[PDB]
Design a protein around this ligand. Structure first.
Ligand SMILES: *[C@@](C)(CO)[C@](*)(O)[C@H](Cc1ccccc1)NC(=O)[C@H](Cc1ccc(OC)cc1)NC(=O)[C@H](C)NC(=O)CN1CCOCC1
Ligand SMILES: *[C@@](C)(CO)[C@](*)(O)[C@H](Cc1ccccc1)NC(=O)[C@H](Cc1ccc(OC)cc1)NC(=O)[C@H](C)NC(=O)CN1CCOCC1
Ligand SMILES: *[C@@](C)(CO)[C@](*)(O)[C@H](Cc1ccccc1)NC(=O)[C@H](Cc1ccc(OC)cc1)NC(=O)[C@H](C)NC(=O)CN1CCOCC1
Ligand SMILES: *[C@@](C)(CO)[C@](*)(O)[C@H](Cc1ccccc1)NC(=O)[C@H](Cc1ccc(OC)cc1)NC(=O)[C@H](C)NC(=O)CN1CCOCC1
Ligand SMILES: [Mg+2]
Ligand SMILES: [Mg+2]
Lengths: 196, 222, 204, 195, 222, 233, 212, 195, 196
């Protein structure tokens, strides 16, 4: 995997490739790695598909039960539940998860959770095997309070390079926009992004 | 893979006299090739005229001393403030150590004090609880350097009476507190010279019927 | 299967006032089994004395090798080899087997016949020279010997006094080691006389 | 291979050597002679790795016999033992070392003295009043420490040897099918048939 | 070990401690780690003790033969090239870690060599177990345009940092100054800050203490 | 049985006449990758203690929570929670020390090295170390990781023994710490330029400094270096 | 270690060395390897020191509780089986114990039981246990008869330990002797090998391998 | 432990079991009885891991004796063997399995027939005319294939057994210090003292 | 290490960091990884210091001997000698070398030689541990026929990011310019490049 989440003026955008691998064979070339744990709290999944999937399901269950009792949870709360699972089961898990969500008070927020189970709140985050190739690019090109169009371009160009160099990344570039307006799904095909 | 043990170095030494007993130990603490502390005491007054040291892995050493100190406390609560005799303390420590026979305390333990006849006493332990009363014991990293010197100077081993054709042995006798401290200081300066994990400082705890006195001496800091 | 501690044994050397002393135990065993109580570890070539601890086959081999080399030296040089020179010869010979070494802990001792200066030296198995003013130790009870020597030794001891010091250093160190002991020999070396004494020590 | 003993007395050297040759769960032979005559007054017993033992023993035998012919003279027990030790001392640092332990019993005709040497596969030589290789020593050495005297006769030495064999037959786990005994003295080498 | 090298105005200085270890035991308390390759090219050695001695002697011998062949004073880069090509051939198995320094017709030089045969250049360098203790001092106090006296002070201070703080280093400080146009001065035991204190007791035994079984005069003559 | 993932490097500290100083860089390394740059590894407990932590960051954050929770628990049914019965550095240390050893004894350690720096209620300077093995020790200067090898030597030149503590001012002590941090930046491959520093004085109290940078660096001599031996160009 | 005990006409002899080892390091020369369980029971220690010391002391407590509960001294068989059943519960965990339970009772007479840490329990007349057991066996077996006197039997036991103390690198220090009769155990002193060896060598004329 | 044999003849079952108990390089005992009487007409010999053997044998003995008291009735050899097999079949999938192999020789009083069962530590039971555990079988089975007849007397069975012991003493590497022989028939269990 | 070589209008430029590591300890913070094998043929060294050093020396020897007989060697020839050593001793070597040189006919040329011993001629090349973090950046920002000032900026910005993310890279940024004019050495200190 190549995955990332980026905060901007109106909220936050999540981005991911669509490649799942079992060795050098691509088991699924149209994977949806962007998964909903709540209305406007989503996550990007990297590492073991089975582990990240089992975790995301448990988190979705916890947040649904939270909402039933205490109303809409914060993005911080969601990240804390992810952390709790990843940290307490660090010995048996291979999961690298980015949590992104939109509050009306807190606007856009991004929390990244690496293997250890540690939590890190950031303006933007990158993760997965293909992220190594874009630390240089993303650092030079990220600005705070970007527009929606600027942020989409930033993610599209970033993941395009990550895909280009990483063999474990490819297919389509899926994105998910989280703003006050609502939730918007975007897709970008090879013919477009490859020739950027 | 995680390794739960470590070696904090240093060395300790116990000598018994007629009406007294000493328990000495250097103040240096180390890991690998680094010095952690130049003054970190590991010889402790545990009450009831019992001094104790558990040299080797300091985490296990501190844990044990902490448990024995606590054992002394509960002995008073459960048995009407009765004084814990040195022989009783020894047997109690055996059970503490053997309690972890299959995941041991990595320490050579030495306690000192007076027996019930008022005479000086030194007991020494292996890591899993084996113990024996002696006049003399050195423990820890430099035990191999110091111990044979003690055999020669405290128990007069390999020393015969001059002119007796190696037939009559040098008679055993108790040593004065002044003579014992001389042997302790020489033992540690000698060990400091040839063992890298020993140095910085020397702290001696002397035990008489009057109580527990301390003495400190500088050691080479290289 | 640690070559340095199969057979067992110890050697110790000291300096005094116009004299040197070198001493060794007599044990040769195969791990726990004591086999021989006559196995001496000190040899001499002219007035230069060499003690060797470690794997006994190599102890024998090196003695035979150094006898060989010192004999050819004497024939060509027309004089006896000196301790300083012999020390260099040992170091050369040991390092020549850098990647397949003799598992030994040799110790040179002797008085230079020209200058009269007492000389002692030790080596590791690979040839590294250890020169010393005071004393050299070697063997399975090297730790014990270091502790005994460092405490008992003083400078400028007379031959009769130096004998007592070195003997007590060896004996009490040997009794704290399972693979050392079973008898002992001490060489007291003056400028032009050498006395050899067999010590009475505990036989366990 | 397994049990080889040696006892030096006043006027002779006596070597005892087990007769069993085992491999796996089968004793293939119970009358095996684990020795070779190197010269008229020198006998070598051996034990160790299968094949290596005989191959080494005969290789030494061939060399000593070659020397005897060349010089028309018998090498001393001390000289033979030193030759054997050097061969093993070479061997140990070879690509495939001889794993053989030997006892060399010989009578020195110049000194009129019996001599017993013990050499292991590393090349570790020692002269002894009594010797043994393998697990045998763990019983016989302490036994001989007690019962051995230096001024014993050959008959006294054989009784002393009977005492060793009896102890081994009692306490050793493996059946070694008794021993072949040989005596080395001024008159040469002879075998005791009834033991 | 701890060894250093420091460049200055008109030359270069190297220094070293004098401790040798087998395991935790101090084998030699005053060994010489400063090695003469040629009169004005000296080498500080860390690692396998015999390797640093043997490799430095071999190259020193060949350098001498080369100097005689070419009728020129030997250059530091020649020793450097010969050492590194030798060490590389043995793929690190000869465990010598060297600081090579000296003056020659080209000027003053300072290099380091690792066991696998990699070389570095620098104004200040340090190798061995106490190189981190030394390098800390060098990084704190080194400057451009050092004088001779300043360079010796910096170099010996860096060695002291090793002596005190590293267990693999101790005893004394050896120094060697190599100035342009002058003879190299080898300062053996330049500092001796680890002198053994007076023992408490003399252990001189009464004559006849040791039991003897046999005596005999040994024949050393022909 | 663990292996550390996201890690923090050296924590250094020392005593001075009126209190203690402690410092640690703001980096969260992921092996050789210098992943996270906004990581605070000094965590104050009350107004009289600072806990510096190195090693696994996930475990550091667990310890953060334990300390945060300790302050809450101490306040419960405690009218003197901000006075006589406030949390002392020695109490905070012994608690962590207990936890660390209990975890190593269950073969599931918190993969950290910790230094608790603070000032006691009677004015005494407190400084003590504890790690994943439960090993504890105290000294006028304390440091973790590379700090132990490089910082301590420098800090021990200022305060070599106990008697040197009254003779050391806060100005001198802070200068030595800031210098040590620079040396670590030169020589530690998993260190950053940005760091935090904390001073706990018995008079002026807790001063927490953020966003500090290593400055006055010597790099100019690099231009004169060529090749690795022979190479004039 | 080296420990032995044998039955004969006049009861039971029990003899042990006094050395403790930590590898080739001699840890002690003055260790007590005979546990006095009661006036009629003895227990010898060989193997892991703490293991032996701890569990034989523990055995003594179980034997005391038996005679309190049953108003009768425990049988040698029962005592040995308590210990053998205990170590069997720990089988595989890594205990190292080579023990001999020796004593007299009315119903059994003089009895010796060998018990070790892999669960073996054996009644017998002669046993030698420890690293130097083979050396003791050599001297004991070759000199043993049932009709030995109390004086000769005591010496043979002492001499057998001495033999092993000499040859075995992991045995020595001093010999501790005991004699068990119908009336109970009798201690026959501590004998330092330092002096005992030369005394025996001279008087007996043995140990001719050593330089006299 | 090592050698345990069993032969079923016309009117009885004969069990032979070695007397040696060895550990390391020392035979600790040479008069050991490797058997337990489970009931008046049922005998079990055993061999395997030290400690496990006796502990298992006595544990079975205790259970069978408990049954005999409860029902005032002796269990058949077939019933006892099935009980023993099940205990071992449980054991093999335990945290620490009993490593013990047994032979169960019994006389069925209802059928008036001798019966010999062989069970290994896995719980593998077989009824046989003759049986053996360990390396013994590699010699005795082929020997008995030749010399065994089903209609033999007890005296003929003992001679047949002497033939087995002689072969083992000749070809086995280890000294097993002879055997204790026991006969199980209509009149119960008795021991042959002179073998 | 982080190292790179870039061709441009007037010739070619080599670039490198200055960090040498023995584990996490920096053995040398002012290393010169840019080494001369001929007047206007240089190389960047990554991997084992001892191996790359021994190789570069042998190559320098071969090219000196070539020049004595056949005159100035091509940059291709130099790369071929590097290849021959690296390929034939692949089992015993850990070396990743970039070869760069200036001919008057062929202008600037860059050959990269990874671990295997394979040769690859490229417009520009990147290598060493820290190069992984700038594949994205360098691909997006490289243009052919750049100016000297543009190429220096490209290398400076590239290595700045490589250094920023790679712990095994740091210190100063050394560069070597190869043109018809001659050979120019450049250096850039942390205070400058860090705040780019
Ligand atoms: C990229 C490919 C690599 O990091 C992504 O992280 C991607 C994440 C993803 C994939 C699908 C849906 C959501 C998120 N990971 C994978 O595709 C993953 C590769 C991987 C497997 C196991 C790992 O840790 C042990 C780490 C990475 N592929 C899978 O999980 C596939 C479906 N299954 C396997 O490869 C089977 N493995 C399971 C673990 O044991 C070995 C066999
Ligand atoms: C400091 C003291 C290391 O602690 C130095 O590096 C020192 C260098 C030195 C010493 C004397 C003269 C010149 C230079 N090195 C040693 O003292 C060295 C430490 C060491 C031991 C083993 C090593 O690798 C296995 C590496 C370093 N000590 C020795 O070489 C001693 C004298 N010899 C041995 O320990 C025997 N070695 C020989 C090499 O092979 C393994 C056994
Ligand atoms: C002879 C001397 C050979 O050891 C005896 O068996 C002797 C018997 C003995 C009995 C009572 C008191 C002291 C000595 N045994 C030892 O001295 C014994 C040898 C031994 C050590 C370790 C073993 O591993 C299980 C087995 C035997 N020595 C000790 O027990 C020493 C003093 N202690 C340790 O080694 C501590 N170890 C023990 C195992 O657990 C880890 C710590
Ligand atoms: C960066 C640091 C990592 O790729 C560079 O490649 C750098 C390249 C360099 C350094 C100096 C001069 C020119 C070029 N490489 C290193 O600094 C290198 C790290 C490394 C070592 C060995 C390798 O393969 C086995 C790969 C990378 N450092 C060294 O060579 C240092 C001087 N020596 C050691 O680390 C000693 N090693 C040698 C190999 O065996 C283990 C011990
Ligand atoms: Mg002994
Ligand atoms: Mg960096």
């Amino acid at each position: 995997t190549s995955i990332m989440a980026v905060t901007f003026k109106d909220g936050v955008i999540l981005g991911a490739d669509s490649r799942t691998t079992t060795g050098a064979y691509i088991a699924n070339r149209v994977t949806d790695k962007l998964t909903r744990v709540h209305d406007k709290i989503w996550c990007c999944r990297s590492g073991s598909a089975a582990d990240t999937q089992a975790i995301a399901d448990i988190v979705q269950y916890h947040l649904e039960l939270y909402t039933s009792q205490y109303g809409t949870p914060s993005t911080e709360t969601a990240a804390s539940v992810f952390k709790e699972l990843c940290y307490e089961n660090k010995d048996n898990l291979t999961a690298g998860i980015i949590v992104a969500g939109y509050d009306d008070k807190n606007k856009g927020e991004v929390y990244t959770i690496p293997l250890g189970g540690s939590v890190h709140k950031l303006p933007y985050a990158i993760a997965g095997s293909g992220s190594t190739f874009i630390y240089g690019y993303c650092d030079k090109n990220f600005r705070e309070n970007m527009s929606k169009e600027e942020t989409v371009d930033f993610i599209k160009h970033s993941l395009s390079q990550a895909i280009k160099w990483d063999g474990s990344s490819g297919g389509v570039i899926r994105m998910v926009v989280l703003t006050a307006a609502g939730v918007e799904r975007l897709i970008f095909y090879p013919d477009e992004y490859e020739q950027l | 893979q995680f390794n739960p043990y470590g070696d904090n170095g240093g060395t300790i030494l116990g000598i018994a006299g007629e009406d007294f007993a000493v328990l000495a130990g250097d103040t240096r603490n180390i890991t690998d090739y680094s010095i952690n502390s130049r003054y970190e005491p590991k010889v402790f007054d545990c009450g009831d005229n019992i001094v104790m040291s558990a040299n080797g892995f300091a985490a296990d050493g501190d844990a044990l001393v902490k448990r024995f100190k606590n054992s002394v406390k509960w002995y008073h609560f459960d048995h009407n403030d009765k004084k814990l005799s040195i022989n009783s303390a020894a047997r109690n420590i055996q059970h503490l150590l053997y309690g972890k026979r299959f995941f041991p305390y990595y320490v050579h333990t030495i306690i000192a004090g007076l027996d019930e006849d008022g005479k000086g006493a030194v007991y020494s332990f292996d890591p899993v609880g084996s113990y024996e009363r002696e006049q003399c014991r050195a423990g820890g990293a430099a035990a191999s350097l110091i111990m044979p010197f003690l055999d020669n100077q405290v128990n007069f081993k390999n020393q015969y009476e001059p002119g007796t054709n190696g037939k009559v042995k040098k008679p055993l006798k108790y040593l004065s507190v002044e003579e014992v401290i001389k042997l302790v200081r020489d033992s540690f300066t000698s060990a400091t010279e040839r063992h890298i994990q020993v140095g910085d400082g020397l702290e001696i705890l002397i035990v008489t019927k009057d109580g527990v006195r301390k003495e400190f001496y500088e050691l080479k800091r290289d | 299967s640690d070559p340095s501690s199969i057979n067992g044994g110890i050697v110790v050397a000291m300096t005094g006032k116009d004299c040197v002393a070198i001493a060794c135990d007599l044990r040769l065993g195969s791990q726990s089994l004591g086999v021989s109580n006559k196995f001496e570890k000190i040899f001499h070539y002219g007035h230069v004395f060499l003690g060797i601890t470690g794997l006994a086959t190599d102890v024998t081999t090196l003695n035979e090798m150094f006898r060989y080399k010192t004999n050819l030296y004497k024939l060509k040089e027309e004089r006896a080899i000196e301790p300083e020179t012999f020390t260099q010869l040992v170091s050369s010979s040991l390092y020549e087997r850098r990647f397949g070494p003799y598992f030994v802990g040799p110790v040179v001792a002797g008085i230079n016949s020209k200058s009269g200066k007492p000389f002692i030296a030790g080596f590791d198995l690979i040839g590294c020279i250890d020169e010393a003013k005071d004393f050299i130790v070697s063997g399975t009870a090297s730790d014990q010997l270091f502790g005994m020597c460092e405490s008992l030794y003083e400078p400028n001891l007379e031959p009769e006094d130096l004998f007592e010091t070195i003997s007590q250093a060896l004996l009490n160190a040997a009794d704290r080691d399972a693979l050392s002991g079973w008898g002992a020999v001490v060489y007291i070396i003056k400028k032009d006389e050498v006395v050899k004494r067999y010590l009475k020590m505990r036989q366990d | 291979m397994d049990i080889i003993l040696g006892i030096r007395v006043q006027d002779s050297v006596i070597l005892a050597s087990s007769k069993a040759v085992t491999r796996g769960i089968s004793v293939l032979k119970d009358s095996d002679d684990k020795t070779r005559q190197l010269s008229p007054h020198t006998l070598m017993s051996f034990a160790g790795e299968a094949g290596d033992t005989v191959q080494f023993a005969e290789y030494i035998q061939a060399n000593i016999q070659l020397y005897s012919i060349r010089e028309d003279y018998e090498l001393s027990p001390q000289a033979v033992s030193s030759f054997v030790r050097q061969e093993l001392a070479k061997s140990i640092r070879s690509r495939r070392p001889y794993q053989v332990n030997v006892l060399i019993g010989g009578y020195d005709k110049k000194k009129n003295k019996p001599e017993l040497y013990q050499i292991d596969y590393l090349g570790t030589k020692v002269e002894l009043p009594y010797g043994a290789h393998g697990y045998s020593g763990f019983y016989t050495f302490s036994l001989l420490d007690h019962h051995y005297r230096p001024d014993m006769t050959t008959e006294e030495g054989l009784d002393l040897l009977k005492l060793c064999v009896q102890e081994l037959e009692k306490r050793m786990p493996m059946d070694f099918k008794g021993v072949i005994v040989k005596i080395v003295d001024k008159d040469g080498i002879r075998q005791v048939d009834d033991f | 070990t701890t060894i250093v090298g420091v460049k200055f105005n008109n030359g270069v200085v190297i220094a070293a401690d004098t401790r040798s270890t087998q395991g935790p035991i101090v084998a030699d308390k005053n060994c010489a780690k400063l090695h003469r390759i040629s009169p004005k090219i000296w080498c500080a050695g860390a690692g396998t003790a015999a390797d640093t001695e043997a490799v430095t002697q071999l190259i020193g011998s060949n350098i001498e033969l080369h100097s005689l062949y070419t009728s020129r004073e030997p250059r530091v880069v020649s020793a450097l090239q010969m050492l590194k090509q030798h060490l590389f051939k043995y793929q690190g198995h000869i465990g010598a870690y060297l600081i090579v320094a000296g003056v020659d017709p080209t000027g003053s030089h300072l290099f380091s060599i690792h066991a696998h045969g990699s070389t570095d250049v620098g104004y200040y360098l340090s190798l061995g177990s106490g190189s981190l203790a030394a390098m800390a001092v060098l990084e704190s106090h080194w400057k451009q345009d050092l004088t001779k006296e300043e360079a010796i002070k910096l170099a010996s201070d860096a060695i002291q940092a090793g002596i005190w703080n590293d267990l693999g280093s101790g005893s004394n400080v050896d120094v060697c100054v190599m100035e342009i146009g002058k003879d190299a001065e080898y300062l053996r035991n330049y500092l001796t800050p680890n002198v053994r204190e007076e023992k408490q007791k003399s252990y001189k035994f009464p004559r006849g203490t040791t039991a003897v079984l046999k005596e005999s005069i040994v024949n050393i003559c022909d | 049985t663990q292996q550390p993932i996201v890690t923090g490097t050296s924590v250094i500290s020392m005593k001075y006449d009126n209190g203690v100083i402690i410092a640690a860089d703001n980096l969260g390394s992921y092996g050789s990758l210098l992943r996270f740059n906004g990581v605070e590894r000094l965590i104050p407990v009350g107004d009289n203690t600072v806990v510096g932590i190195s090693g696994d960051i996930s475990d550091m954050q667990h310890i953060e929570r334990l300390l945060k929770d300790l302050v809450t628990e101490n306040a419960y049914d405690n009218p003197l929670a901000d006075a006589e019965e406030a949390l002392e550095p020695s109490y905070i240390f012994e608690y962590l020390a207990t936890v660390m050893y209990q975890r190593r004894s269950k073969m599931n350690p918190l993969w950290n090295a910790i230094i608790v720096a603070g000032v006691q209620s009677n004015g005494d300077q407190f400084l003590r170390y504890v790690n994943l093995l439960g090993v504890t020790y105290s000294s006028p200067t304390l440091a973790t990781g590379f700090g132990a090898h490089m910082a301590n030597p420098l800090l021990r030149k200022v305060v070599d023994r106990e008697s040197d503590i009254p003779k050391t001012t806060v100005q001198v002590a802070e200068e030595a710490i800031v210098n040590a941090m620079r040396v670590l930046y030169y020589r530690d491959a998993r260190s950053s330029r940005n760091f935090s520093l904390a001073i706990i004085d018995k008079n002026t109290g807790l001063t927490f400094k953020k966003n500090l940078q290593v400055e006055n660096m010597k790099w100019d001599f690099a231009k004169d270096i060529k090749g690795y031996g022979t190479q004039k160009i | 270690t080296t420990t032995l005990a044998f039955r004969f006409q006049g009861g039971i002899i029990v003899a042990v060395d006094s050395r403790a080892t930590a590898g080739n390091w001699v840890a002690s020369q003055t260790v007590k390897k005979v546990i006095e369980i009661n006036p009629f029971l003895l227990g010898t220690t060989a193997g892991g020191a703490a293991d032996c010391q701890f569990w034989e002391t523990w055995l003594g407590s179980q034997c005391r509780l038996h005679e309190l509960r049953e108003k009768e001294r425990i049988s040698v068989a029962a005592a040995s089986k308590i210990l053998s059943n205990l170590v069997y519960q720990y089988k595989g965990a890594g205990l190292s114990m080579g023990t001999m339970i020796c004593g007299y009772t009315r119903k059994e007479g003089p009895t010796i039981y060998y018990v070790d840490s892999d669960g073996t329990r054996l009644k017998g007349d002669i046993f030698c246990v420890g690293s130097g057991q083979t050396f003791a066996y050599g001297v004991l077996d070759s000199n043993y008869k049932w009709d030995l006197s109390v004086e000769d039997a005591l010496y043979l036991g002492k001499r057998s330990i001495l033999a092993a103390a000499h040859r075995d690198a992991y045995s020595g220090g001093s010999v501790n002797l005991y004699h068990v009769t119908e009336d109970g155990w009798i201690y026959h002193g501590n004998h330092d090998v330092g002096e005992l060896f030369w005394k025996v060598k001279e008087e007996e004329g043995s140990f001719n391998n050593v330089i006299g």
